[PDB]
Every structure is written in C-alpha cells, then in structure tokens.
C-alpha cells in the first residue's frame, strides 16, 4: 500500500506547525480538536492565530523557522508558501524521525492528512495519496450519505458497555455474537438518538439476557473463478466475519485480500480430501465460524458434498454460498456465451480428471446442438479431440481454451476441433475447454481483453 | 475528536514489532504491505516469520525486548501475550515519542490501527477508537463491497492524465463532471488493470472526445436466482452507477431494492415484450448517452438470450460488458442440498431447456445430473420419454421453485412421480434428475417452505 493509516492520540503531545496563513489555520484547528499541545512558528499570522493565542490554546513563535522547536514533537506540519522553508522543515523532521506533512507536496511528506467523515467516536478517513484529490472528495460525500448521523451514539454506547460485555461473556466468540446483534438492532439505535433511556435499558437487558448459540458452523463459500468482483455479497460477508478460512489454490489472491485480516488462514492442496473434512469438523466443533473458501462454485466439481456429509449427524450447523463457476466466468469474459438462440439446447459441464478406471461416454458427448465445457481437461485435450472426432463431431467445430478466466492474466486460444490438442500445449492450468458453435461468437461479443 | 487519522508513508522506514505469534504475524504482514523496514523482536517466532526472514523481507531479533531496537524507529507495535513486556515496550516508545500500538489494549497505545480498505493509492480507514471493533469490521465489509477492485488504477492514471488540465474544461463545474465520467468508467479501469493499453487510449480519448453529458454504455448484470446476497460485488457496483436499469421480473424485488435510488427503471417483463423491443430499448437508451444496466435473473449467458441483446449494441459502437451471475442450477443446488456433482455420481451436469426436439436417448444416458430450465410444462413428456428411453424408474428427481428465496419450495421423489410432482410447483422452477438428488436429506440446510 502507498500509506499506512493510523489513528493518533495527540492529547497533551507537542506538535509544531510552521506557517501562519489559511492552510496553517485549517491544520491547526484539526490539531487543537485532537488535543495537541500546538506551537505555530511563522513569519506572519492571520488573525485567527491571534484569537487562539489570546485564549491560551496554542503558542505562537513569530519569526523564521526554528528547528529546535521540533525537538519535543510527535508531529510536524510544513504550511508555509515557501518551498525552501518547507523542505528545511521536512529535513529537520526526518532527522528527528517526526512524521511530517508538507501541505503543498503529498509525495514529499512522511504523512498526508486524510479527508475525515466524523461520527465520533466513529471516524472514516479517505485519501488518494494526493494523486486524485477530486476522487477523494466524491468518495467523501458518498461515504457521508452512507453513515447515519447517529452512528456515533451507537458506537459511544458500545464503549460504555465493553467492560460489562467482557465480564459477562468469558469467551471472545460469545462477545462477537453479542456485538453483531447489538450493532444491527434498529430500535436500540433509535432509542439512543431520542435519548430514551428506559427504552435503551429495556432492549439492553434483553440483549444481555439472551442465550447465545455456542456451536460453531461451517460455510462453504464459492470464491468464483478469480476476479474478486465476482465474489457474492454473502460470500464477502462470510469471509469478512469468519474465525478461520480453509482455502485451496484456485482461490485468487485478490479474494484472499478480502478475508478478515484478524482471521486464521489454512491452505490445503498443492493434502488429502478426508483430511480437509476433519480440519473443518473439529474446528466447527471447537465453536468457531469456519469458512471453506473454494474456487468457482462449491457443488460443481468442488467435492463440497464430501466436505459437508461429515457434518450432518455430527450436529454441526452448515450452509452453502454458491459461486460463479468457471464455465460462467469464462463464458462472460471470453465473449463466448454458453447458450445462444439455438446454437445449443444443452450445456454439458464435463470433468476430464476421471476415476482410476473411468471412461467418458464419448458417443453421448459428441451429440450436436450443445456447448461442451471440460473442467480439469488440459492434460487430455488430445484424447478429447480424438474421441470427439471418432463419434461424429465435425472437424471444423470451433473450440476455445480459457486460461485463468476473469483474471488480468486471462489468455484465450481458440480454433477448430482438429487443433484442440495443439492449442492445449499453449496454456497451463487452470484452463477450461469450450467446444461448440458458440465459440464463433467470440469475435462479435468479446469485451474484456485480447490478453 | 479523540484520535487524528493520518496516512503514514512507511517505505524503508524502520518500524518494530515486539512479539512473534499469530498476532504479531498479522501486523508484520500489514507493515510489509506498506514497505516498512521491519524488525521483529520476540522470545520465539512462528514459522511465517523465519520464511519472511529467509526471503530477505524483514529482520528478526530472537530474545527479550531490547529498547535500543527503538532507537532509529518510526513506529512500534506491542504484540506479545505478556502485559509486562507490552507495557515496557509502549513506555520505551513514549519516552522516544515513537507512536505505538498495543494490540489488545487500545488506550495503552499512542495510536490505534483502524480497519483498512486498500485501493492504493486510494485508501479508506475505519476506526471507532477502540469502542466498536465489530462495527469497524461491519463498515469495512460494506466499503469493500462498494469500492471497485481497480479504482486504484484509475486513481493513479487520473493524477497523471491531468496534462489535459483545463485543456477543454475551464470551469471547476465542467472538470468535476469529467472526473465524474472518469472515475466510474469501469471499462477504462479493467483495461488499465489488464494492461491492454490499446483498449486504454481507446476508452481514454472517447472520454475526451464524446460530449461531456454522454456516458453511453451497456452492462449485462446477472442478478442470480433471487437471494439478494447472491449478487456479485461488481453486480452491485454496476447497478449503483446505472442511469437506467432494464429488468425483467425474473429479477427479485430484493435485487431491485439495491438499485440506485435515482436511476430510472424500465420494466421489460411480462404481466409479453418480444426480444427485439428489448434489444432496441437498450440500444436507444444507450444512444442517448446513458449508463444502461440490463438486469437479468441468474446468469445472462445461460438461457438468458444475453448474446442476442449484445448483438444489437455491437456494431452501433456502443461499449458493453457482462457481469456473470449465479445461475439457477448453482443457486438451487446450494440452497436445496443437492450438489450438481458428488463423488462418482455424475461425470457431467446437463443444463437443458424445456424449432426442434430434445434428444431423449442422450438425456437418458447414465452418470449425468440433468437440470431442466423452463421445463415445468414438459414435465410429463420428460418423465414419459426418459423412462421409455431407458432411465431407471427409481431415479431420484427434485423440483426447486423460487430457489434461494425466502419462499423456496423443494418437492422430491422418483422419476415415476415427476409429472405429478410438477403440479405442486409454479414457475420459476428447476427440475433436477440424478442420483445427486438423494443427498438432499443429508445436506438440506435451508428451510423448506
Ligand atoms: C482493524 C484491526 C486491525 C488491523 O487492521 O489489522 C483491529 N482488530 C481487527 C479487528 C478485530 N479484532 C478483534 C475483533 C473482535 C472484537 C470484539 O468482538 O469486540 C475484531 C472485530 C472483528 O473483525 O470481528 C479482536 C479484538 N481486537 C480488539 C479487541 C478488544 C480490546 O483489545 O480491547 C478484541 C477482542 C477482545 C475480546 O473479545 O474481549 C481491539 C481492537 N480492534 C480494533 C481493530 C482496534 C480498535 C477498534 C475500535 O476502537 O473501534 C483495536 C484496539 C486493535 C488495534 O488498534 O490494534 C482488525 C480489523 C480487520 C478488518 O476490519 O478486517
Ligand atoms: N493547485 C491549486 O490550485 C491549489 C491546491 C491547494 C491550495 N492552493 C492554494 O494555495 C494557497 C496558499 O496560501 P495560504 O492560504 O497558506 O496563505 P498565506 O500566504 O497567508 O500563507 C503563507 C504563510 O506562510 C508563513 N511563512 C512564510 N515564510 C515563512 C518562514 N520562512 N518561516 C515561517 N513561516 C513562514 C507565513 O506565516 C504566511 O502566513 C492556499 O490558500 C490554497 O487556496 C492552490
Ligand atoms: N479461472 C479459471 N479459468 C479457467 N479454468 C478454471 C478457472 N478456475 C477453475 N477452473 C477449472 O476448474 C477446474 C478445477 S475443478 C473446480 C471447479 C470449480 N468448483 C468451479 O465451479 O469452477 C480446473 O481444472 C480448471 O479446469
Ligand atoms: N429462482 C429460481 N428458482 C428455480 N428456477 C429458476 C429460478 N430462476 C430462474 N429459474 C429457471 O430459469 C428459467 C428461466 S430462463 C433464465 C435462466 C437464467 N439465465 C439463469 O441463469 O438461471 C425458469 O424457467 C426456471 O427454470
Ligand atoms: Cl488525494
Ligand atoms: Cl465511487
Ligand atoms: Cl465433486
Ligand atoms: Cl443456444
Ligand atoms: Cl439462450
Ligand atoms: Cl446414474
Ligand atoms: Cl416452465
């Protein structure tokens, strides 16, 4: 990331502002409200500084920059109109390791000031890093509409209850169930805003009085095929709120960046399958919220059935969030719809990785008016070619292979059936094989990239 | 206000973490993402730390906390399970005026780590000062859903391409409407993200050429089968920047509630709008220079005629894109406890529609999960002809009606009972044929209605 956002306690801590005009003023107001012990060192001062100095709210130092003023300081702000003076202030601060903002110069400061949406004690800060000040302000206002004014009264009450919530709940997993109920009780929010105390207490005592469900849970979540925009709303919720995320390798890194930062991640795979099952079951028995995060959809060649059947009579609550399967993701992003008027009456989602002694039913697969989609079929493209031709599929039937579909790394090779073996040599997994006349639609429908 | 948020530039600045467990490891990773010159001092380290040390990415000091490690430090984090150590650390940090966090003790610290939505260089931070971390996390989740993944790319390209400064826009009012066009153009954004810079300046100079009021594009968004939580993030983002939403009735009311409050709505469904009318409504509304979202149940390219709808816009020079959706097969499969595949049960899932006939001999072959879209009418012919063409009569069947919705109904039995099990359900309904259906009584986690 460009920056690390932090929230500083500035109460009773020395801060220095060099500069005395309109920019200096605005930053000083900020620092005063955070409780900084503030000195302002400037050649000249606009009247607001006189106001503040006369009522004992800051110290004014009238004259050129005095770097010894930095000596006791946690933060410094260079707000003069003189680039030279500002750079001297910046240098002096770096030597002392004091975080420094240079108002005219986002790239040269050691911190920048964010735009602040204030719902104290709840605060939202947004910044483009100085690159895009207009985007920040349009975000700033969109955030404003989204955050109810009274959210502060809810967050304020939460802090007052924290001691009581720590005493009455011994676990920290039971404390989460209480807060999750607390923060979405609309009547409680309302009664706080109306300062209706008897209503606040009535709802509050009921909340405390509620037997919490101690059982854990397992949720199979489909990550989709890679593009993180293709995660579902509910999938996002589960991974934002999970205690532990068990995940395989076809889950994308961008999707992993959406996991609760505070949650335990457990990788499986490139681990046997019955291994995975018990990892979940004992972990859900242990009372924690477990997400099995799976590539694409969990019930299309994900073995999600296997992972769940372990839990049915083991009394473990479970649930399933479907995901965008590879055929759907690769259909959309290659410009190759899986159906179209009648090019196809069927879509066949077919595995290539078959049993110890399993053979696909080629005679059936070669039938006309369908879109074939092979999962896990890279290493048998030549066999797929040879069999489909032998059971009637025309030689010039168009095919496509989508490698890393929906990713910024997505590659699409295509051609006709007698090239399928050759084409497959030009991709690595994960790749999907699409066979059918809809592959020709690519050139009119392909919207996402030429790779 | 009780804490001042600032955005620290940490690239190659010395920071210290004290502790070497899971907690310290999470903080180390965040500080690494920010490019800190990271030292980690702990009595023992979990493996992740020594991996990080072997790839040159940080420095480890094995042993008790030594406060001279703070000597050239900009930021300090106390992440041990030992309050005595954490106090020693934060105290050592305060006398040096090094901003310090005690992970576990928000007011021991001199700073708090907020929740972070990272769209670098664009960033959002959420904190309540230690009073409401769950609330902070709830707000992170929603901001993650609302902020596109590659807004950052656009952020970068923006500050740079203002070389066309006032160029053609002298009014702050004119400019901020160009920036409005600019930051929500998600095609520019993915073309940036994909590095396709022929598609960049394509989309770029259209933005600088076309009239400033004009925003003409079409997005096919799949709404999934009805549960509003099955919209994708990008689905949501798109239906929130729409000028005009064209929706079709297989779009649930819950999904429509998420639609932009100020978007226009055109209901193209039944009460029977033929396809061509739809195909030019989209065309027309996009010709007017409006950001058009066409909402469709499930996934647009699976029996949705999505391709037909894009054939219109293709040669009209109107940009389009597609956001796939959860198709009814997946949604019904997940919410009914019937996986489309399981072990050796099925080598292939068949999504099939209810001029021409269906190849019953092929539908009848073994080791398939058959999924019948729009087949409630034909449910009796289906039953008849599947048995006639050799499918074993005991084959489990299930019909899922309004799958994923708060009124979904699952009625199941055996191929003999297919036609009559259909009278119990109304459109929209899926017919599932195959041995996977039997797992329902072991995997039914939704509530049947
Ligand atoms: C942002 C993030 C750091 C990061 O970015 O990595 C950080 N912790 C994360 C989330 C989170 N951590 C925990 C919970 C469950 C809490 C619950 O149930 O109440 C959650 C919420 C959740 O996600 O469920 C365990 C925990 N944490 C704290 C306590 C209480 C205490 O210590 O007093 C307890 C439980 C002890 C108990 O159960 O008793 C303290 C804090 N948690 C805050 C945020 C800070 C002030 C919050 C504010 O003032 O509003 C602060 C002081 C940490 C700091 O400043 O370092 C990261 C968000 C990642 C994301 O958003 O994805
Ligand atoms: N690119 C843009 O379009 C853009 C973006 C942001 C801001 N701006 C403008 O730039 C303006 C800057 O002007 P200002 O508001 O600061 O008014 P100002 O002229 O009063 O600020 C100068 C201040 O710097 C101090 N100063 C100068 N030399 C000094 C020295 N050697 N030691 C100590 N202090 C010294 C003085 O106290 C003086 O008050 C802002 O008002 C803002 O509107 C323009
Ligand atoms: N992004 C992607 N692009 C192309 N193929 C992918 C893919 N992600 C997964 N696949 C395919 O999925 C196979 C794994 S089987 C798991 C598939 C997943 N459950 C789904 O519903 O899509 C891989 O062999 C590969 O063929
Ligand atoms: N919520 C739902 N529950 C069960 N079946 C549904 C459904 N929504 C759509 N369908 C099925 O889809 C048919 C309409 S055709 C449109 C399908 C859509 N493109 C998709 O991906 O799902 C209906 O006849 C019904 O069989
Ligand atoms: Cl900015
Ligand atoms: Cl936005
Ligand atoms: Cl499977
Ligand atoms: Cl078709
Ligand atoms: Cl179709
Ligand atoms: Cl079978
Ligand atoms: Cl029907």
Numbering used by the authors:
A (entry chain A): 1 to 270, 277 to 457
B (entry chain B): 1 to 271, 276 to 358, 363 to 457
Reproduce passages from the article.
A soak experiment with precorrin-2 and NADH resulted in a structure with low-occupancy precorrin-2 bound to one active site but NADH, also at low occupancy, bound to the other. Precorrin-2 is less oxidatively stable than more highly conjugated tetrapyrroles, and this was apparent in the weaker density of the central ring and partial occupancy of the molecule as a whole. Precorrin-2 is a highly oxygen-sensitive dipyrrocorphin that lacks the ring conjugation of the later, more stable, isobacteriochlorins, sirohydrochlorin and siroheme. Nevertheless, we see similar changes to the conformation of the helical domain and surrounding loops that are associated with tetrapyrrole binding, so we were able to assign a binding position for precorrin-2 that positions C15 towards the Rossmann fold. Interestingly, in the precorrin-2 bound structure, D104 is in two conformations whose occupancies correspond to the partial occupancy of the precorrin-2 molecule. Consequently, although both tetrapyrroles coordinate positively charged amino-acid side chains with their eight carboxylates, the ring of the less rigid precorrin-2 is not as ordered as it is in the sirohydrochlorin. Precorrin-2, oriented with the C2 and C7 methyl groups buried in hydrophobic pockets and coordinated by positively charged amino acids at each corner, presents C15 toward the Rossmann fold where a tightly docked NAD+ places its nicotinamide ring.
Siroheme is the modified isobacteriochlorin tetrapyrrole used by siroheme-dependent sulfite and nitrite reductases (SiR/NiRs) in catalyzing the six-electron reduction of sulfite to sulfide or nitrite to ammonia. CysG is encoded by a gene fusion between a C-terminal SUMT (CysGA) and an N-terminal bifunctional dehydrogenase/ferrochelatase (CysGB). The N-terminal enzyme module, CysGB, is a three-domain bifunctional dehydrogenase/ATP-independent class III ferrochelatase12 that performs the final two steps of siroheme biosynthesis. The C-terminal enzyme module, CysGA, is homologous to a well-studied class of SAM-dependent uro’gen III methyltransferases (SUMTs) that catalyzes the methylations to generate precorrin-210,13.
